[PDB]
């Protein structure tokens, strides 16, 4: 009788090659010891079925409704298709239902509302379509409602928000329209509110400060308009995720009193005005994402009072002034992105006290002076984008002693001197863009030691000498851009051993000779070699 | 330099001692040593007052204090908390039979939230719960409550949410006119009599759950006044026909369930369900509905779920159903329909088992 149902559930799968060989109603007498089934030790009836992560690949048989004493179902990660069968609704004792990570389609069945004992409804990441029905408000014990990763439609009826026992409202990534409601703060027991990635218009309700039980508020990427209400300051959230919307106005200063905050993301909106300095006393936040707005004024030096700040993104704004030296108090700063602003002055030396600093990006500003020497102390540095600025001086020798550098962009500046040979021993370097400067001397042959390198750009400089012949050793180099220099001599024959060299631009030099047989000569641009007087090829502007 | 009001603090000590958590008696200041489950707020005079008090494993990241099943009880010292705004007890079970204490009325004007959910309370609801004049949320779900719903609930003028589900309440539903009432949940009780007429005068109602009771009579033709009503569940009662001639004033209605009113015994006029712009769920199964499936159901735009199984429906399935491509569940099984089934391979192969037509001897092809 129960083995009947278990056998139908097995038979409704597909890819069960050597999978449920346990399940054999006649060669395996005890159905209470088959793979993934659990009975209670008194009636020996199925109460819990966990076939997680087996890729059984079929459908969910209606016979699952014939295990009346089921308390837990876990069919996650099995490439299951079809609709959620109505018969799950007559699993009256069901307490936990997890169908996440499958390919189930259709509506959330009406029979789901018959499960008066249900506490966890996890339907994450399927192809479910249709509305979030009001019937889910008829589940008196539901604590976890995770419907993320589907194609659900319609509005979030405010009927849903009248619930005292709900803990987790996960609706991320659907196509939900309409608005938030003020009744949102009636979710008096909720700790997680996630509606990111939908299409909800309207504004943030002004009474949202009544939602004091929330631990994570996430309404990001949603097309929400209006301003940030003052009462946002009464939230006790640790995560406030408002990014990717159409918010206007200034940043409410009251956000500076939310000391329980750990992640503050106001980015990719249309905010204006200054960065409120009160943000300094946010001594427990580790992520401050204010990028992609129209902010104005300085990087407040009080940002250095954020002891636990680790990820600071202020890029794509309109900030002015200097980089505050007090940023060097952030001993735990991991990533610093000040790109695309109007900052001014030197890179502060004190920023070498951010020992754990891992990515540093000041691209697109008006910074001045030289790279301070204390940057050699940034041992953990990995991404270094000083591009498009007004730096001067020579590329420091010590820059080569940052062993973990994999992306180095000094382009678009006014660097002088010759390239340090230590740049050649950046073992893990993948991208090296030194173009658009005043670099002189020879192109270093030590660049041959760049084991991992894939892109080398040193165009628009004053480089002289010869194209280093050791570049042929570079087995991952796919882009070699040397144009607009004063390199002379012949294009090395060893460049043919660059197994992956797809793009090469050595035009506008003093190169002579012919081009050697390249195994990817046709993938090059037409003007790859123009502007070399004594270079002999089959193009206009050559003597041949 | 702020401190908690001393009598409110000693009252907190005694409440906690009565609930099984004698440890709270040791905190020098409960309002500044605030635990999860207690909330204080200061007046202009820099003195803290207790405002919220919660018990039971409602959980979250954090959990509230639980109650020792051998010792706990609700202490009268709650009346010493003059400023209490919210009181939570969730699954906080005592040793033995305990009634809802009448002294809860003695903290009247301050209280706005009274939640006594699943606590095993017995006997009748105390009448003096009507003293809680500013109550906006009242939750007495799944207890064992004797007798009638108190008439003094008339005094909850500001009530937003009333939940008395899962008890043994008897008598007819008293007819309060609560102008701000949003959710009314009285399902799974033993209520009788007709649908109160005054029900249709609480216009803020978005949810009416009267399912699993003994309510008799017809659906009043004045439900059209509930222009904000989202969910109307009248399943498993003793309701009777007919439908109101017109249901057009019920926009925002997403779900209407009348399943199991086994002596409803009327027909569905073509004119009945026209105009329901947001109707998604319509369950009319096992109600002895007579006549022919109105084709107007075809033109309901938001309709996803249509349940008509277990009735005395007869005749042709409207051919206009051929043109319906948004139904996810449609049950017509166990009637005496008679024509040829008019569904396209298109939607037959999409719906599969979620389209039920069996046990109609008449049906063809």
UniProtKB/Swiss-Prot annotation, chain A:
As for membrane topology, the entry says: Single-pass type I membrane protein
Q: Which GO terms describe its biological process?
A: embryo sac development; plant ovule development; stomatal complex morphogenesis
The residues that carry sugar chains are 41, 50, 199, 210, 281, 305, 350, 385, 414, 433, 505, 510, 520
The record's EC number reads: 2.7.11.1
Gene Ontology molecular function: any one: receptor serine/threonine kinase binding
Q: According to its UniProt record, in which tissues is this protein expressed? A: Mostly expressed in developing organs, including bud clusters, flowers, siliques and young rosettes. Also detected in mature aboveground organs, such as leaves, stems and pedicels, but barely in roots.
- Which sequence ranges are listed under topological domain Extracellular? 1-544
User: Spans of the LRR repeats?
Assistant: 13-36, 48-67, 68-91, 93-115, 116-139, 141-163, 165-187, 188-211, 212-234, 235-258, 259-284, 286-306, 307-330, 332-354, 356-377, 378-402, 404-426, 427-449, 451-473, 474-498, 500-523
Q: What class of enzyme is it?
A: transferase
Catalytic activity entry: L-seryl-[protein] + ATP = O-phospho-L-seryl-[protein] + ADP + H(+); L-threonyl-[protein] + ATP = O-phospho-L-threonyl-[protein] + ADP + H(+)
The organism's superkingdom is given as: Eukaryota
Q: Which family does it belong to?
A: Belongs to the protein kinase superfamily. Ser/Thr protein kinase family.
Q: What does this protein do?
A: Receptor kinase that regulates inflorescence architecture and organ shape as well as stomatal patterning, including density and clustering, together with ER and ERL2. Redundantly involved with ER in procambial development regulation. Forms a functional ligand-receptor pair with EPF1 (AC Q8S8I4). Forms a constitutive complex with TMM involved in the recognition of the stomatal regulatory peptides EPF1, EPF2 and EPFL9/STOMAGEN.
Per UniProt, subunit arrangement is: Homodimer and heterodimer with ERECTA and TMM. Interacts with EPF1 and EPF2. Interacts with SERK1, SERK2, SERK3/BAK1 and SERK4 in a EPF1-induced manner.
This chain belongs to which protein, by name? Answer: LRR receptor-like serine/threonine-protein kinase ERL1
Q: Which gene encodes it?
A: ERL1
Q: Which span of the entire protein is present here?
A: 28 to 571 of 966
Swiss-Prot record, chain B:
Superkingdom of origin: Eukaryota
Q: Which residues form a coiled coil?
A: none
Q: Which keywords does the record carry?
A: Cell membrane, Glycoprotein, Immunity, Innate immunity, Leucine-rich repeat, Membrane, Plant defense, Repeat, Signal, Transmembrane, Transmembrane helix
How does the protein's chain sit in the membrane according to the entry?
A: Single-pass type I membrane protein
Where in the sequence does glycosylation occur per the annotation? 131, 146, 312
Effect of gene disruption? Lack of stomata in stem, hypocotyl and on the adaxial side of the sepal. By contrast, cotyledons, anthers and abaxial side of the sepal have excess stomata, with many in direct contact and producing clusters. Altered responses to abscisic acid (ABA). Enhanced susceptibility to the necrotrophic fungus Plectosphaerella cucumerina BMM (PcBMM).
Record GO biological process: asymmetric cell division; cellular response to abscisic acid stimulus; defense response to fungus; innate immune response; regulation of antifungal innate immune response; response to abscisic acid; stomatal complex formation; stomatal complex patterning
A GO term for molecular function: peptide binding
**Cell compartments where the protein resides:** Cell membrane
Give residue spans on the Extracellular membrane side. Answer: 1-365
Could you tell me what induces this protein?
Answer: Up-regulated by SPCH-SCRM module.
Extent of the LRR repeats: 108-132, 133-158, 160-178, 179-202, 204-226, 227-250, 252-275, 276-300, 301-323, 325-351
Record GO cellular component, one term: plasma membrane
Q: What is the additional note?
A: TMM lacks an intracellular kinase domain and may participate in active signal transduction only through physical interaction with other proteins. Overexpression of TMM leads to altered formation of trichomes.
Assembly behavior:
Forms heterodimer with ERECTA or ERL1 through their extracellular domains. Not able to form homodimer. Interacts with EPF2 but not with EPF1. Interacts with SERK1, SERK2, SERK3/BAK1 and SERK4. Interacts with EPFL9/STOMAGEN.
Q: State the function annotated in the UniProt record.
A: Promotes cell fate progression in stomatal development. In leaves, needed to correctly orient spacing divisions, to limit the number of asymmetric divisions in neighbor cells, and to promote the asymmetric (amplifying) divisions of meristemoids. In stems, promotes the conversion of meristemoids into guard mother cells (GMC). Positively regulates CAPRICE (CPC) expression in differentiating stomaless-forming cell files. Forms constitutive complexes with ERECTA and ERL1 involved in the recognition of the stomatal regulatory peptides EPF1, EPF2 and EPFL9/STOMAGEN.
Q: Which family does it belong to?
A: Belongs to the RLP family.
Give the protein's recorded name: Protein TOO MANY MOUTHS
The organism of origin for this protein: Arabidopsis thaliana (Mouse-ear cress)
The shown chain, on whole-protein numbering, covers 51 to 415 of 496
